Design a protein around this nucleic acid. Sequence first.
DNA 1: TTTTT
DNA 2: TTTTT
Lengths: 500, 491
Amino acid sequence: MNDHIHRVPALTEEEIDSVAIKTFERYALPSSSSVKRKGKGVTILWFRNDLRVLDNDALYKAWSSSDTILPVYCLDPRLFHTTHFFNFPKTGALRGGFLMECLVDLRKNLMKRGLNLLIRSGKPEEILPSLAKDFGARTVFAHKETCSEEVDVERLVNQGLKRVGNSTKLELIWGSTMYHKDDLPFDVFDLPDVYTQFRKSVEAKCSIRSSTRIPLSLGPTPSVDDWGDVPTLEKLGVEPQEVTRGMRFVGGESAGVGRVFEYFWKKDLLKVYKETRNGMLGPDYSTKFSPWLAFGCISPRFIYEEVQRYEKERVANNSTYWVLFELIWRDYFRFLSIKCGNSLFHLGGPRNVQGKWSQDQKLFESWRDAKTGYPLIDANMKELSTTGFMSNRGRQIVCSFLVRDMGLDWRMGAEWFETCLLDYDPCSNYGNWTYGAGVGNDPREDRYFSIPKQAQNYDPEGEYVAFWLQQLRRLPKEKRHWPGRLMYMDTVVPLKHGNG
Amino acid sequence: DHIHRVPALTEEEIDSVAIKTFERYALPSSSSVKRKGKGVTILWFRNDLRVLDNDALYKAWSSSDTILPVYCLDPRLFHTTHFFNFPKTGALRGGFLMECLVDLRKNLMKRGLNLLIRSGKPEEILPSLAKDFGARTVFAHKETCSEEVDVERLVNQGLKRVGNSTKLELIWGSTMYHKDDLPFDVFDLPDVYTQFRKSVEAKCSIRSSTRIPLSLGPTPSVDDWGDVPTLEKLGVEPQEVTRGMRFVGGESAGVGRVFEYFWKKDLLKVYKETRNGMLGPDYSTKFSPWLAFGCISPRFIYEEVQRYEKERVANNSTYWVLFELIWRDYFRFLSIKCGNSLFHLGGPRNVNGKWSQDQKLFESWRDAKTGYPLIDANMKELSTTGFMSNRGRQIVCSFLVRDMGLDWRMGAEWFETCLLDYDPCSNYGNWTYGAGVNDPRYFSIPKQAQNYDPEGEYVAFWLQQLRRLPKEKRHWPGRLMYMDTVVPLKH
DNA sequence: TTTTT
DNA sequence: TTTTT
Ligand SMILES: Cc1cc2nc3c(=O)[nH]c(=O)nc-3n(C[C@H](O)[C@H](O)[C@H](O)COP(=O)(O)OP(=O)(O)OC[C@H]3O[C@@H](n4cnc5c(N)ncnc54)[C@H](O)[C@@H]3O)c2cc1C
Ligand SMILES: Cc1cc2nc3c(=O)[nH]c(=O)nc-3n(C[C@H](O)[C@H](O)[C@H](O)COP(=O)(O)OP(=O)(O)OC[C@H]3O[C@@H](n4cnc5c(N)ncnc54)[C@H](O)[C@@H]3O)c2cc1C
Ligand SMILES: Nc1nc(=O)c2c([nH]1)NC[C@@H]1CN(c3ccc(C(=O)N[C@@H](CCC(=O)O)C(=O)O)cc3)CN21
Ligand SMILES: Nc1nc(=O)c2c([nH]1)NC[C@@H]1CN(c3ccc(C(=O)N[C@@H](CCC(=O)O)C(=O)O)cc3)CN21
Ligand SMILES: [Cl-]
Ligand SMILES: [Cl-]
Ligand SMILES: [Cl-]
């Protein structure tokens, strides 16, 4: 396989810059004298989880409705407080570091287009109105978000701008999804409660829009005395962390488009994606696009166009389709977050299921700290805390284990994923947790995963567990799955099914 | 005949009062706001059938040099109810709607505009008009519930299909407190009304009503402004009010009733004392039918309350009218938070109980043959007038759910057919609340009869056979004097 | 019913 | 906890 730490993408920094230039050139708006800018005044572009220049409608609209743009990112102190119910760190060190890399790359890429990124630490509803006043901005453009916390910030910013006068308007633009909200065959209040019904409808009745093309010249900015430093984690009360084993994701749009190139074109792996996507070990088994999608470093419309080109130039098969099937799951949970609102975060979930659930700290800590006694579980939980990533197969398994085998309040698992995952997204995280916990609005199915069966089918040689739990390396297949207590450790709970 | 027009003003008195109200609130001139070169716009009316305090109308006017107002008679409005298939719009509300449209056209014409009336789906009508007239924009008020928001989607996509350029602009209205001014996003709306009320009263201001110029013209050149469709064309047999309150449709009549209730009769200052009554126009504002169609707005009502508090009296009753309008806002915002759970058997909380849909039981409730005078008189008033007292609505809801054990949506859908003031937010909001399937309650029929109809005058008015009887037997008559009871009382 | 003893 | 045995 290779026992080195695996950079994602694995491209050299010079390969990344070359691919980035070619990609930006391929999708560039071939000049635009037709767009009228003169006399349109100053605008502020407020970045959140859309840290890219490519295929960015908020940026396009800001540019087309102004003569001067002030791009701004606010490091919101609330991002580094604690989680809602159980008070874990709101943002763990690994995602914190990924965010900083995203910001460094965004500033660099904006500079290539005649702009810069203003960085400030503080609450957007305090920073943005002050900037709008100082620079005389007519508008603040930003992407629309869906969940409670984010929409509350939108309200506070809008009310803040109002409080300094009329004129300055907050303009929120839909983004994030492969299928556009406005193009759906239903309002989101009537979103089907079954995914298959949603997928069939959009596939039959909708089209995917082309990527928005962005000009190579986006300047000028206003005259700014201090563009601000990239913040450091220590200032935010977070101890920096470096990956010591496994995958080391690299933040930013440049690296993100680099990974699309790497996975699709250089390694030619898209043609077998459906075959390998239930793997757990290494970068090759799946796209690994999720951290870049969560921060908006890349966009699904861009990915879809790359898939289209791959299908023309190389091959179209069930694997080239399945990547889109999975991006449609991302769309679904995004839209479902609007339909469900805060019931997405409640114990009973969307259908308000009753009864039970332990919050035993000792049990939870054994799951969190990879000390359950089941190698399959512990390896996954160790991968998570070490790298900020876990395989899709692993996420499903550790969810079932915590809910069903341990009997724990599922929100303890969801909030720990919120702390740890580079790709943390409230819609996808709480969506999949409620789905896996059996508290979604989807019809009743008892989705119990057998740990022994999962180990045999998806880690048949014990390669995955041996990688993360190196004391198991010397053992053959069967002991890797079931090592026994002295070699490994005690089991904290019995298994509900598939032998105790 | 014992028929009471609401308001009790002649058509000419209504005109006089409306003129004075329009002039009081008129925007004094406005050459300042420039219009020239701004092109054609379409104003799409739905349940906002007024000129006063209309932000959709003002924005359409300020962003254009020419305005085409349109109302579409949507055929889906005259199909059937969702679960139990009663008429989607009953004859009495249908008649009220047509009167509102005639008045709106009149009031728009007096401002140099007109009203284009077409029968059909907005998503088919509006894009065609946009294209033919070269409209840059279609302005309309934003709605909150599934059916209305689906029409918004279909119109938007229909405009995209003719081309880019033509944009649908949806404006928040309807409420006393503005959505954008709330101290929380609607996803975090308090599940208890009292917390909502205390929050908005402490942290929000009520905006001044939007003032409208007296001259709004011109319109485009239009060949046929369209006739008002008859109820018979739409598959509804006309119905007249044969007894009780006869509400008069339109903004003019609505502003007339505000004048009548507040100023002519001076009743606002006792509103809280009288509001649990059931007989006659005097006991409450009776604003609801005009509010439901948007013939009047709560910001205008608040401005009239302020003036009354200055020119007449301020006390607990003058406040209480605002308290109740805040309930209207709450259910509107709750419709967004709850979505379609507002219409489901289990409600927002998804309660799992057991509920009969027995057709025989439901019909004795519907047709005022329960054998309980208080219940039957209220149900008769509803079917005869399209209105029922607030006190009555609470009682008949309690009776249907708890004494008869019926699926509450049967009663909610019957209200949807009959009520002049039908509003999905307020109706299904109040039914879920009353049925105990709300976000956060039994009525004793005998107690209610004694406390809110002591002399039996209400039941006697609607139930002719009780009129001869003394109050003792008006409360509890019996089989021979009235009829048998279809179910016993739970308590 | 995406992925599930 | 609008009105509530
Ligand atoms: C308990 C649990 C929690 C999860 N939390 C998150 C989360 O916080 N953020 C997140 O992005 N995904 C989450 N997922 C979904 C999924 O596991 C990850 O998106 C996936 O593992 C990322 O790896 P990849 O990019 O190589 O995925 P691929 O298999 O290559 O899929 C391609 C893309 O499709 C999307 N996708 C794939 N599967 C899902 C899915 N199950 N739900 C939604 N989108 C999907 C992602 O954008 C992903 O990048 C969660 C799943 C579970 C079971
Ligand atoms: C089962 C049930 C169903 C209802 N259905 C509707 C409906 O479809 N449409 C509707 O407008 N009202 C509905 N209501 C609320 C209320 O009964 C009526 O608004 C009221 O009777 C109208 O009479 P009024 O204008 O004279 O009220 P007033 O006592 O004079 O109150 C003034 C205004 O405040 C508002 N208001 C008062 N009470 C309520 C309330 N409980 N909920 C919301 N707003 C209120 C109304 O806009 C009303 O016009 C319902 C109540 C119940 C119990
Ligand atoms: N990025 C992100 N955005 C979020 O909105 C979010 C997360 N992450 N992670 C988990 C938290 C928890 N979420 C919650 C959980 C509960 C309520 C809630 O119950 N609110 C009440 C109203 C206010 C109150 O009384 O607390 C409700 O009735 O909905 C809201 C948001 C928001 N969640
Ligand atoms: N004016 C008005 N507007 C409405 O939206 C409305 C009324 N009146 N009167 C009652 C009906 C019933 N309402 C309903 C009831 C159920 C769903 C519903 O359950 N929809 C599904 C998705 C579509 C489906 O599967 O049927 C859902 O999951 O929410 C929607 C609207 C809309 N209601
Ligand atoms: Cl976008
Ligand atoms: Cl308005
Ligand atoms: Cl009467």
